[PDB]
């Protein structure tokens, strides 16, 4: 007896390993990623996080890709030297285990992931999807 868990927490592809995708997060209020690898990685890979804005030509198509700022809570000490949020899949993540994470403050209507420079040839072996939460409208 499993439910149509699709509605009420749907999910979309955000990085299929070869090209990114913007996923709309306006209709929902809370969201997060679920990383997953398909083959063993060779070094720590880092992805950048991007947020879009409604394009002036049409409010149902994302505009250009701005980069989401970084928010420390209290414990954060590393601060990532840039003030621009980013994830980093650590080395030794066997490809039968997922990893979850999300940004503490959304902004805009869309959200996107792309591999940061240096780790663009390992990201071809990873998959990143986004699942939202309750629908505001």
């Amino acid at each position: 007896m499993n439910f149509n868990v699709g509605v009420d927490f749907p999910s979309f592809i955000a990085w299929d390993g070869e090209e990114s995708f913007p996923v709309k997060v306006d209709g929902f209020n809370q969201f997060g990623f679920t990383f997953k690898t398909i083959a063993a990685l060779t070094a720590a890979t880092t992805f950048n996080i991007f947020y879009h804005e409604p394009s002036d030509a049409d409010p149902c198509v994302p505009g250009p890709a701005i980069r989401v700022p970084e928010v420390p809570f209290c414990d954060t000490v590393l601060l990532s030297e840039d003030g621009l949020a980013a994830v980093t899949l650590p080395e030794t993540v066997t490809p039968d285990s997922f990893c979850a994470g999300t940004v503490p403050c959304m902004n805009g209507q869309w959200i996107s992931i792309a591999p940061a420079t240096g780790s663009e040839t390992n990201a071809a072996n990873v998959q990143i999807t986004v699942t939202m939460k309750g629908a505001t409208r």
Partner: protein, 223 residues
């Protein structure tokens, strides 16, 4: 940070303009204290209507020419670096990409012979510069990555000495003007430019008190 107290035009107190030294690459800030001239003119202080102009009194025209290119987002961009340096004599060309002035959102694989490729950062749409140097001659190469729809405008090829668009501020409570004075990495040591500042005051009723001064920027290496 430079600081110049302007003369109050009372008929009281080598060259005419004051001296500003600069170094190729820096971006500094200047402060001017119009207090001595604006305080007696008791009104509503200064108004943000200052106007700048830059003229060259010694140029030594650039040896190597600048250039411009275009590419769509995510797509790599290849180009040449040899047809920009017409050399008068016959000699070798030691192309170089200054690390301190590399790109800001990509990577450049400088080939062996005036060839290079530019991989733009993932999901990036804007303009991006990097300053090559042929045989010591410095010139910039501007690349504009387009967001795959149509196009972006063609940026204006920053001058050797410039004042940015809007980073000025004027404090009407202490009669002090601030602005930023940036020097391209393509400035040539020894050259001299001249910046004239036209600052406008205002009376209680809404008329103007203009004031003009000048400054002599001397591009010196090693500060």
């Amino acid at each position: 940070m430079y600081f110049f107290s302007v003369d109050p035009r009372n008929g009281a107190s080598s060259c005419c303009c004051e001296s500003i030294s600069a170094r190729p690459g820096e971006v500094n800030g200047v402060m001017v204290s119009y207090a001595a001239w604006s305080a007696p003119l008791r009104g509503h202080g200064l108004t943000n209507k200052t106007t700048f102009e830059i003229d060259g009194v010694s140029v030594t025209p650039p040896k190597v020419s600048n250039a411009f290119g275009r590419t769509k987002v995510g797509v790599v961009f290849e180009g040449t670096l040899s047809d920009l340096f017409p050399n008068p004599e016959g000699e070798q060309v030691e192309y170089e990409i200054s690390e301190l002035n590399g790109p800001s959102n990509g990577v450049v694989e400088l080939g062996a012979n005036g060839a290079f490729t530019y991989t733009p950062g993932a999901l990036f749409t804007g303009v991006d510069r990097f300053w090559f140097s042929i045989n010591g001659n410095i010139g910039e190469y501007v690349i504009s990555v387009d967001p795959t729809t149509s196009e972006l405008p063609q940026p204006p090829f920053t001058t050797p000495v410039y004042v940015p668009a809007a980073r000025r501020s004027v404090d009407p409570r202490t009669h002090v003007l601030k602005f930023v004075l940036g020097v391209s990495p393509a400035a040539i040591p020894g050259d001299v430019y001249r910046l004239t500042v036209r600052q406008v005051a205002i009376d209680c009723d809404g008329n103007e008190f203009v004031h003009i001064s000048c400054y002599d920027i001397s591009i010196g290496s090693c500060g």
